[PDB]
Amino acid sequence: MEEEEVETFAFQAEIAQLMSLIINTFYSNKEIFLRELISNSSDALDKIRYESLTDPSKLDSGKELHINLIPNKQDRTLTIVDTGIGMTKADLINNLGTIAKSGTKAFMEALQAGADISMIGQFGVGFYSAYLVAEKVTVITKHNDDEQYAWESSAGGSFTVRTDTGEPMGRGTKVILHLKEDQTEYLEERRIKEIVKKHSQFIGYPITLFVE
Ligand SMILES: CC(C)(C)c1cc(C(=O)N2CCOCC2)ccc1O
């Protein structure tokens, strides 16, 4: 038998309000969610490249810096996998819910004035777009300093962080989107290629689509 430690955290007040706003209001442009995830994946990769200045040991990695997309129609999930820096426990808690973001209220205000959900990234809260198409989000992450963790929230006010004892993934972050029944278009290969070409064409790393 294996064992994992679980922690439940409250979402910062305005993050929780934002998550409600997304989950219960219709928008679409929803496809911008993929660009946000690829962008964050791209930053984690930039950090790996710069960390080398403070830790030359990083250069010794055989791992290729890239982004993989994996649609699974049998399970109704879309997974975005990167080989970036990863996130320690503190990084997950601080950056995925617990700390205030100075752009949160302003964004909820812009949205109420009909601004496009596509502005989410420039307000400092782009990750919560994942909730435009997913009823539950699992974030598997592995950083050099620390253990592998899984973050998870079906929304509802909180999120748990636990030490992941599942399949090791090596350095990086894996975002697993459990799609709402009506968002199945994001499992199709033609739909997937359309939004990448459309929103993530200038990304500096290889992006790969795995089909079937
Ligand atoms: C936080 C989230 C889920 C948006 C995300 C984080 C990373 C990640 O590992 N980060 C740590 C290093 O700095 C960039 C974010 C990579 C992809 C991704 O979608």
What is the rounded distance in angstroms from the CA atom of residue 133 to the CA atom of residue 186? 9
**For the chain, domain boundaries:** 1-212
Angle at 23 between CA 20 and CA 28, to 5 degrees: 130
Of all atoms in ligand 1, which is nearest to the CA of residue 151?
A: 3
What is the rounded distance in angstroms from the CA atom of residue 186 to the CA atom of residue 135? 14
| Contact in structure between 127 and 137 (CB atoms under 8 Å) | no
Quick count: other Cβ atoms within 10 Å of Cβ 83?
Answer: 22
Which one, of 128, 117, 112, 104, lies nearest residue 27 by Cα?
117
Q: Which residues define the annotated binding site for ATP? A: 40, 82, 101, 127
What is the rounded distance in angstroms from the CA atom of residue 20 to the CA atom of residue 153? 12
Probe ligand 1: pick from 33, 66, 81, 173, max atoms within 8 Å of CB?
173
What is the rounded distance in angstroms from the CA atom of residue 180 to the CA atom of residue 177? 9
At residue 111, what is the residue type? L
Residues with CB under 6 A from ligand 1: 37, 40-41, 43-44, 47, 82, 84-87, 91, 95-96, 127, 139, 141, 173, 175
What determination technique applies here?
X-ray
- Domain 1-212 of CATH type 3.20.20.10: no
Measured in angstroms, how far is the CA atom of residue 40 from the centroid of ligand 1? 5
